[PDB]
Amino acid sequence: SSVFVPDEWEVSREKITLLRELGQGSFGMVYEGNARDIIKGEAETRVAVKTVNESASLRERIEFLNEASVMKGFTCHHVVRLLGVVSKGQPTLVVMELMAHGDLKSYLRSLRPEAENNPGRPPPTLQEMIQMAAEIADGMAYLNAKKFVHRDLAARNCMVAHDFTVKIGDFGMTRDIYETDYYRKGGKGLLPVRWMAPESLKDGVFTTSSDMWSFGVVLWEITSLAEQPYQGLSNEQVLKFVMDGGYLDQPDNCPERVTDLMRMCWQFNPKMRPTFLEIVNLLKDDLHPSFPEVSFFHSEENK
Amino acid sequence: PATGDFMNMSPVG
Numbered sequence: 001s002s003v004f005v006p007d008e009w010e011v012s013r014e015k016i017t018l019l020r021e022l023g024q025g026s027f028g029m030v031y032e033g034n035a036r037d038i039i040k041g042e043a044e045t046r047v048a049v050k051t052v053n054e055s056a057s058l059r060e061r062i063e064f065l066n067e068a069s070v071m072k073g074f075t076c077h078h079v080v081r082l083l084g085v086v087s088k089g090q091p092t093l094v095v096m097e098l099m100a101h102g103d104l105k106s107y108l109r110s111l112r113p114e115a116e117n118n119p120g121r122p123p124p125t126l127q128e129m130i131q132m133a134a135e136i137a138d139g140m141a142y143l144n145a146k147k148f149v150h151r152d153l154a155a156r157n158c159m160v161a162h163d164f165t166v167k168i169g170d171f172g173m174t175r176d177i178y179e180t181d182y183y184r185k186g187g188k189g190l191l192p193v194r195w196m197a198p199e200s201l202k203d204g205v206f207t208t209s210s211d212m213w214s215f216g217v218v219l220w221e222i223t224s225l226a227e228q229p230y231q232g233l234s235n236e237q238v239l240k241f242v243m244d245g246g247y248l249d250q251p252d253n254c255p256e257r258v259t260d261l262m263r264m265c266w267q268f269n270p271k272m273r274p275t276f277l278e279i280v281n282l283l284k285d286d287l288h289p290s291f292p293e294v295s296f297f298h299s300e301e302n303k
Numbered sequence: 304p305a306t307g308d309f310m311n312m313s314p315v316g
């Protein structure tokens with residue numbers, strides 16, 4: 001009988017409760033809800049739950065499969081944590097930790113002073129920006145340590161917690177590079193052009209160095225409150241422009257300090273761009289007191 | 304769902 005070979009992540013649908021829509025993914029839905037006893041010590045836990053549309057294509061379900069699986073093996077304060085999986089019945093439910101304020105792009109946009117949904121507080125300060133950069137870098141460094149290239153780092157894929165901690169999310173495009181330290185895409189596929197490195201666009205190659213390039217664009221998204229990168233140029237135009245050595249300007253009044261990291265991230269030669277650990281190292285001295293307490297950078301694991 | 308953020312493609316090289 002099957003009962004004697006259970007999945008440790010299986011969770012009873014009975015423990016899950018949906019409250020509202022947190023957003024819509026390209027082929028599923030993300031809901032906010034609470035789950036009864038899914039974490040030892042917590043009677044109830046606020047959570048985000050991802051579903052998959054009946055009409056989801058094989059490819060999409062295959063991408064959804066990878067997302068959940070790579071996550072099963074992560075454990076880092078700056079990475080969205082997987083909590084359980086409901087598969088006994090339909091529809092399948094993937095339960096993750098709730099990031100109260102949603103994705104960074106949305107969040108950033110709400111802080112605009114004219115935003116119809118401004119929460120009542122000023123745009124991110126220099127300090128709050130370094131903190132974000134530092135948290136995204138840490139999570140990513142952890143990811144790199146585990147030997148995984150994300151391939152799709154952007155504001156939309158970064159989440160913001162109730163306490164405002166930013167964490168890496170959406171691991172659908174993630175790939176193991178353990179043996180070769182790189183991933184070379186084969187055929188055709190939906191790629192996030194406006195966030196890709198030149199070598200990745202030219203030869204379809206992905207490294208932690210290309211992920212560093214995306215980080216820079218995320219810094220840019222951050223300092224412009226999530227405007228559109230290469231605003232006014234079609235994906236085909238950007239592709240040609242970047243491969244020719246092109247890159248983004250510094251958003252208006254972008255902090256000098258932030259502009260520097262972007263200069264480093266967009267070096268044409270991938271080997272010259274910095275690594276995430278070096279990025280946390282550059283900012284470690286101007287962060288919340290709790291950082292050394294939860295960062296991967298400060299943990300014994302980082303060896 | 305930022306669909307516009309993706310382009311169907313194969314390495315130009």
Ligand SMILES: *NC(=O)CSP(=O)(O)OP(=O)(O)OP(=O)(O)OC[C@H]1O[C@@H](n2cnc3c(N)ncnc32)[C@H](O)[C@@H]1O
Pocket residue numbers: 022023024025026027028029030048050080096097098099100101102103106152156157159169170192304305306308309
């Ligand atoms: N290249 C791409 O990543 C696809 S475009 P996208 O807008 O990023 O959508 P997609 O990645 O397909 O969206 P996803 O299903 O991941 O989720 C959509 C929105 O739901 C909110 N969300 C997701 N996980 C959340 C957690 N854990 N907690 C709170 N809110 C969550 C976000 O607003 C996300 O944009």
Ligand SMILES: [Mg+2]
Pocket residue numbers: 156157170
């Ligand atoms: Mg996404």
Ligand SMILES: [Mg+2]
Pocket residue numbers: 025170172
């Ligand atoms: Mg996805």
